[PDB]
Amino acid sequence: GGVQTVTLIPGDGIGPEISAAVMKIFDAAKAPIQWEERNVTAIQGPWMIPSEAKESMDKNKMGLKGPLKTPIAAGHPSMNLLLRKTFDLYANVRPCVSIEGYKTPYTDVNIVTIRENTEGEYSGIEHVIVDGVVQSIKLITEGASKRIAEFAFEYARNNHRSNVTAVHKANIMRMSDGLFLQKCREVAESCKDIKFNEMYLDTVCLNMVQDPSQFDVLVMPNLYGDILSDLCAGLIGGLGVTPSGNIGANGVAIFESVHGTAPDIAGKDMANPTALLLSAVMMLRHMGLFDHAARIEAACFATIKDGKSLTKDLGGNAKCSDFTEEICRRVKD
Amino acid sequence: SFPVTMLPGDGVGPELMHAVKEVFKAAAVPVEFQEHHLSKLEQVLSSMKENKVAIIGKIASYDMRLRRKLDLFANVVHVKSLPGYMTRHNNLDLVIIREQTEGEYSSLEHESARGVIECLKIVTRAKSQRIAKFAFDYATKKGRGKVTAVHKANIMKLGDGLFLQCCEEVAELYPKIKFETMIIDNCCMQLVQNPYQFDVLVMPNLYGNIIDNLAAGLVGGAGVVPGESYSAEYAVFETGARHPFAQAVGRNIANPTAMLLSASNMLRHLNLEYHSSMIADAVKKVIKVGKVRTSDMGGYATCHDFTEEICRRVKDLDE
């Protein structure tokens, strides 16, 4: 009931191709979405992202972001760092599910890694104490830890998920990770409809590679999230087929592809939009267009099990457009 | 001859050490174990001063103190598939070299305001240049061809960049070994997708924790991956993935494979090549024939049953 505007950041490289392919798949299923292309490439006035990009994301809360090219300048900061602080992106969510057409040594994987995005070892605080002695400061606070453990039990109930696991190393970093655990438990007792437990980062790592089936929703501090999420990516096929969203403050969210900009195949009709598509599916669900999302999702999955059209990186000769149009065909059920 | 210090340790440690001496007495091994049932107890440093090698179970914290009282700065974990035991990744062969005395492991934590905890992570050029020369000496001593340095220098520009910088500097002195760098989270994902691109890996403490257990689970898990920790005078042998709930559950259920395997490494270090090759090959052959397998490997055998079979094969003469 009403047509919405998503800020679309096409990005670099195969960026615009996959963006414009997702726009076409949304069109096909007549999904209530206008797009508003913006550019997040940073400038610095009196460091920041363009004003038009901020006013856009602030007005319409949703974004869809393709792969950005890694800047060249030493002094140029990380683009995700500028994105995070601008909109207070505090929860990075990664649902990792095996794709049925794409065979991997792991077959039964269905995991969601909620990752605290604001602090941890990414505090940005380092000091050179003396010559050849550096000191990086890991920061854990009670506010932020609580915020993330609340999101994770929400996500777990909203997306009808049954277990949440707090992953820490509180045996080593007794005070920092201890506080994180302390608040996770605090939230877990006020949401007793979800079986909550704890594990050690190294116990989860050793178990993930042997049997991912036992895991569900996982919530963890920043560094642990960064490692674990890419680790689980490899369980299902890699950054090319994994969605990603960063929930932030003021209803803002940006859903993103985490895969590379891939310039060697820019222009040529060979990119894969599966990753950017499944992220925009997340966006739809986060917006409450649940049937448009379950539909689009069903099509893309059906296309990949057929095998008829796969791009170069899933074992096909099919072009980016032959893949896209098969989905669009499929989504008019 | 040959005195060796033995710390049986927390958890099933006592039961693995019982298996070790049982196979040792089986293979008639010239090694007498001088053991301390720990947990100052700096009696340990005295015995290592005379003995110079140890076999240890699972034990700033004691572990990171004892390491520091022994200057066990380098940790080596051998990730190598065993032929009989099948996994999603077979025929794998990696070396994980890990710094042990720095990073987040020294309890440098404090409260700057109510509910704001700071925790310090220390990287120094001293300890990094050292672990970096040790990794390249390991690559040359052993015939390995590549040393990949794992870091997150894009976020921790100083510090993880200091560690990186020492690796590149050390790497010029060894022009016969190839040197690559990779980012920890990228490395973890490549380790599940394709771990065969790696030869030797070198990383600071916390990343080494992660990649020790992650690789360990590639080739069979906490019961079969062995590991050493070296000083410049000392050699301590343990298990490779030594995480908190590693083998602590169960009684007469644990896998002695990793402990035996590094015990045979200890024998190789002691220059007892004959007994090292025997015990190792016995263990490896009980696993290949697949007669007896412990629960973590998919079988029904007790720890005693597995060890019994290792002895039956060290003693066999028709081999």
Residue numbers in the entry:
A (entry chain B): 2 to 47, 51 to 337
B (entry chain C): 14 to 52, 62 to 81, 92 to 351
Task: Reproduce text from the manuscript describing this model.
Human NAD-IDH is a key enzyme in the TCA cycle, which catalyzes the oxidative decarboxylation of ICT into α-KG. The α and β subunits form a heterodimer (αβ), and the α and γ subunits form another heterodimer (αγ), which are assembled into a heterotetramer (α2βγ) and further into a heterooctamer (the heterotetramer and heterooctamer are also called holoenzyme).
In this structure, there is no metal ion or ligand bound at the active site. In the αβ structure, the key residues at the pseudo-allosteric site, the heterodimer interface, and the active site assume similar conformations and form hydrogen-bonding interactions comparable with those in the αCaβ structure, indicating that the αβ structure also exhibits an active overall conformation (data not shown). Similarly, in the αβ structure, Asp-230A, Asp-234A, and Asp-217B assume positions comparable with those in the αCaβ structure and are not in proper positions or conformations to bind the metal ion effectively. Structural analyses suggest that the active overall conformation of the αβ and αCaβ structures could be attributed to the changes of some residues at the pseudo-allosteric site and a unique hydrogen-bonding network, which stabilize the side chain of Tyr-137B and the β5B-β6B loop in the active conformations and further trigger the conformational changes of the heterodimer interface and the active site.
